Amino acid sequence: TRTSVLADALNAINNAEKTGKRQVLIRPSSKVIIKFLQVMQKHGYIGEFEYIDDHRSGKIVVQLNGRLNKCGVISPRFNVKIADVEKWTANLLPARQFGYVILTTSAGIMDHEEAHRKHVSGKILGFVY
Amino acid sequence: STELTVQSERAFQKQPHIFTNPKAKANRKTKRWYKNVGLGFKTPKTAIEGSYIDKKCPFTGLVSIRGKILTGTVVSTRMHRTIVIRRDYLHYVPKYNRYEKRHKNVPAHVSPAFRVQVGDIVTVGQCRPISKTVRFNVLKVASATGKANKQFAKF
Amino acid sequence: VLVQDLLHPTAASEARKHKLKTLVQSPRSHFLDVKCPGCLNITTVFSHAQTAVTCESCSTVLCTPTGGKAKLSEGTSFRRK
Amino acid sequence: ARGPKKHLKRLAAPHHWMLDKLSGCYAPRPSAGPHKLRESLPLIVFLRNRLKYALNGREVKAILMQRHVKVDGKVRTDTTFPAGFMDVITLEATNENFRLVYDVKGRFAVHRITDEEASYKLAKVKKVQLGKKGIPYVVTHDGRTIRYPDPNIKVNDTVKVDLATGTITDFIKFDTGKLVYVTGGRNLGRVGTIVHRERHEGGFDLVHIKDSLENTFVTRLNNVFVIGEPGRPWISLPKGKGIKLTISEERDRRRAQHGL
Amino acid sequence: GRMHSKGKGMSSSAIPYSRNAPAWFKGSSDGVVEQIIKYARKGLTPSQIGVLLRDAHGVTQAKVITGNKILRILKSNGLAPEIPEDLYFLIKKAVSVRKHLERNRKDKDAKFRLILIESRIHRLARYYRTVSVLPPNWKYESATASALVN
Amino acid sequence: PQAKILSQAPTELELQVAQAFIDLENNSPELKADLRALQFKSIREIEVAGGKKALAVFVPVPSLAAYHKVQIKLTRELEKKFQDRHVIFLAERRILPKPSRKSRQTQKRPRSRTLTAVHDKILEDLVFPTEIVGKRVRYLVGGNKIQKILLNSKDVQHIDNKLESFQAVYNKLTGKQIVFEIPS
RNA sequence: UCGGUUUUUCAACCGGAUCUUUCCUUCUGGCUAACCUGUACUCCUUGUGGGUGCAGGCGAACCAGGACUUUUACUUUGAAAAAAUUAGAGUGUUCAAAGCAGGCGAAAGCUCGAAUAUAUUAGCAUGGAAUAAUGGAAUAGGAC
Ligand SMILES: [Mg+2]
Ligand SMILES: [Zn+2]
């Protein structure tokens, strides 16, 4: 079995980026993945995503800018506290200030900076750049 | 839990310091005393309707409830007035950022008022050390999952 | 290969791929109405019929299911509807 | 093991005494008293270090045994007498009267008061029991008992004691929207008006408290001590009005007051 | 991935979109239901019923035309098998294997296959027990399986 | 007509619709006896931005099948008689609220009473027997949800010049931006 | 303006409030405070500037009383975690480690002190309800 759909999607995206291909096909998709993509779009890491979210499960096709470098996951979604977020950023993000650690928080799925602004940490979902 | 055969023992069971008048008969004959335990845990009507005994009872005995109230799963009733409740867990190990799973077999007292079966969510409150291990006693028993008595055989 | 539209696939490309692998998971199977040489009205038969089939009243074999599709006996006329 | 602890070590001592950790290895353990060891403040800690009226234990003894010192009413011959909260210390020399009230940051500040307010103690109601013969008695937070009170006195209420006699003149009923004092924990010595109660079942009962600077803080009823109506206190408060100022504010104050 | 034997195998039956019409494949739902009921009465499994429908009548899925699936419909009208189809089939298979073993014992491959089948049954059985279908404690050995047969 | 058609009480639009229905009945054989089970709930004459108007009718959910059995011709007649205002038939589906973390959860809440599925159902209904074969969704760079609705080329003459109006109606109903399309 | 101070024009960033086609445990009332209100009308600039005021009628601004509440795992805030130590303020122990004092007048006597922050996890109360399980009404003994 595929256990983490989001992870697989991210892997696919990464592979596409590596290739230089400017379109993907996320296979099972839906909800969390969609939200992640939305967040990415907000900062403009992916160009435009369109899903044949049909009568089954959903299939996302991402027309992407290619400016995205890498987009991770971590499937043991660790319960991030408001202080060790810095540590996480240091570990995961390349630059000190460029890039976004994706957090699934009670306030919703968004990047790290936005979470900080709302002062709600949650669980790590992934990261871009 | 027990149920039926009330006084039948070596010593005849009495609710202490409380008395029923044998001179004149009123309406429902016997007065059995009961306390409203508190903390919003509803009293069972079966405790008043059905006349057992039990000194250890939260409701009909001189047992009080103050402290910590825990909830767990009923595992063992192969006993008498006693119940083994498995408490669940997530013990966080700092080293790996991850959670363990652990078992705590909290042994508690089951009042004859309450009907309890193996494999149910049960609320238990602190008490006077009533046995070697038993320091808790039943407060409320919910349904097994959602169905009350619908579990039956095939067509 | 730079850009391929994975939302508007061409009529040949889709045909090349099988059944489920296409963007819309749809059956390749078109199940048919039959006009047998005996009866006077239409009856429905599946292209991949699994078991033996009878027309209407008389026990007349329409299709023998071998492998994928159904071997339509003798020669009957049929439409996709 | 074996029995009760008699000595006390100058490190194991409570924090809001600010005793010199180096000079001396034993602190004064306050004796058996009205207030809790943690809450209470002994006389030698006070007299020797807060006021600087003495410099040695011998000196303190001399001060005490000559019987110029009076706490709430009586003299108290012993050194290690527990004086906690709201307690009045009247010294016969120059009539320098004090009430032991906390400061902004948690210290028993040397608050100098005249004989007018230094005549009554405020006392929190711990419990109300009907004693022998069928007599209601009220329990003060300083262990003290007053037999026959006002019938409408409940717990968490606060009561005036005239010191000269063990009698109640007036009491402040516990009400949301009545100015208050906090006596323990992380937030200590701050003053607010009480917004809302949290009743709760089975131990620990919280109240939300709001000050003049719009900063909410929630505290247990154990450390909550009512002072009176919002606006009017029954006790004169220490300098800075006893409001827990921010570190930035403190810094500003420091940088504003360079005067010689 | 196909459980026991190695081999992926993507052999899968597709289901189309629009779970409502196939309009020119006529016949009211009631008629279909009645047909299904008749089939059940004659003694056929839901899968078998479906196959029959595929063969003869203008149907696509019963979940499309009627509001319910076939098994659900059967349950509603109280005409469901004792042990839910698949399980029954598995038990039959197991019985057959046991018989074969009895006939000739040294066939170790056969024994292995029997073991596999038993395991599969157990796997199925546990889940069935969980979803309140079958009464608690269900044995699947020669003492009960033989009795069951059909 | 106040109890036969309205199922409620007020509104001039309702009265107009009732009148139209009555007029339709006066044909006599096929257009009177075949349609006496129908009930007409809330009607909203909702407008397309710059142009014509659209009569958005809500009808009972226990029926709908009945409407499908009739419809089409009736709709055409309505279009003809009430001048250039596009008639649309919809179902009054409730949408039960999301089970909050607080609040007493009365029942499981049916999957038929959700939001998204209900909306999809409405969309399916709104397109008069033509049927959807793909609900593809574009999500723009700004953060806008726009849905393509794939329609089969077999019989599109019924709608044709009503697509924009349909889209507008959908927007008015929900806020979701809708587009219709036909492949080669 | 005598380096700080707030309106406006604008951006951004949340937060809460909303009716939205879509609900906050629910009332038994306590109590209402404000108007959907208006009963009389007016102090007064030709009047929706301004509200004292009781007979139909706002729930939340908390009180106390039931009735039942799917539960958790998270996370936020708060309360806690005795001091010494560590981190860290302030302070010329001749500096430094130190300590917790000292510093300032006219050097004839009045005030700033001695902060705070973490120390995670187990319980404690709240804010959040995305994530992850868990459970609702199928032989309805189901809901109001
Ligand atoms: Mg240091
Ligand atoms: Zn023939």
Curated annotation (Swiss-Prot), chain A:
A GO molecular function term, named singly, is: structural constituent of ribosome
Which one GO biological process term can you cite for this protein?
Answer: translation
One Pfam family it belongs to: Ribosomal_S8
**GO cellular component terms, A-Z:** ribonucleoprotein complex; ribosome
Q: What keywords does the record list, in alphabetical order?
A: Ribonucleoprotein, Ribosomal protein
Q: Which family does it belong to?
A: Belongs to the universal ribosomal protein uS8 family.
- Give the protein's recorded name: Small ribosomal subunit protein uS8
Task: Look up and give the organism this protein is from.
Answer: Kluyveromyces lactis (strain ATCC 8585 / CBS 2359 / DSM 70799 / NBRC 1267 / NRRL Y-1140 / WM37) (Yeast)
